[PDB]
Structure 1
Amino acid sequence: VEYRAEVGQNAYLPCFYTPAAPGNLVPVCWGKGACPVFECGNVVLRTDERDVNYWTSRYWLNGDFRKGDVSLTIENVTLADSGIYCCRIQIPGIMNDEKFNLKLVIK
């Protein structure tokens, strides 16, 4: 759902998948909106299955991020970072995506 935090504190956007394989690498919806195949607009991040591909201090992960924690506990947030966020779980298999249109705004 929608969560709030302060400057530099812990955000959350609840969405989790499973780590697949070193040969079945799959990205995630990260950005803002609805990523049908791929665009919930203004895409800001992608991750992977067997590692965590791309995450920053401004796009931050406090949990166990290598096993599929792509719930971005966003550190040092501005309002330009805030808004609706792209997150959707691409389950391995055909036609099984769950699109979350979830707003995570931090002051």
Structure 2
Amino acid sequence: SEVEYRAEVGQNAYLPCFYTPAAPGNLVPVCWGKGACPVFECGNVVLRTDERDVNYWTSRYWLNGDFRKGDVSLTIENVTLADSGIYCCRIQIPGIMNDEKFNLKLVIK
């Protein structure tokens, strides 16, 4: 079919997203949301970081990887069937018309 990420109800879901910081400690803000990246900034926002730290999160949504090294992969805890969908991870590279947009398809059964 096409790239997808899978989980059963009650498991954690794992959606990958990565960037390479220009130099260590120099982080780029990231936008995670539910819905494809053409929607608003990154869909219906679930989690955000800035140059310093996580600045916004929704219950059950986590960055448990080394986000200070560019691993901004998402964990969704205790998934239900309502969690299926496209998710947008947007790397907000400083500057205009240069963001990286990743659309991740999650299928729960």
The alignment's TM-score, normalised by the length of structure 2, stands at 0.67
Displacement of 1:97: 1.6
Q: Does 1:64 align with 2:60?
A: no
| 1:10-38 C-alpha deviation (Å, 9 max, x unpaired) | 42222123557999885433223333584
**Number of equivalent positions:** 107
Quick one: percent identity of the two aligned structures?
100
CA distance in 2 between partners of 1:73 and 1:6 (Å) = 14
Which runs of 5 or more structure 1 residues have no equivalent in the other structure? Answer: none
| 1:41-94 C-alpha deviation (Å, 9 max, x unpaired) | 322222223222234551023322344332112211122222110112222233
Which runs of 5 or more structure 2 residues have no equivalent in the other structure? Answer: none
Q: 1:65 to 1:3 in 2, by over 3 A?
A: same
Runs of 4 or more consecutive aligned structure 1 residues displaced over 4 Å after TM superposition = 18-26
Counterpart contact for 1:51–1:67, Cα < 8 Å: no
RMSD: 3.3
Q: Which moved more, 1:66-75 or 1:48-57?
A: 48-57
Counterpart contact for 1:52–1:65, Cα < 8 Å: no
Q: Per the alignment, in what secondary structure is the counterpart of residue 40 of structure 1? A: coil
Q: 1:74 to 1:102 in 2, by over 3 A?
A: same
Displacement of 1:104: 1.7
The alignment's TM-score, normalised by the length of structure 1, stands at 0.68
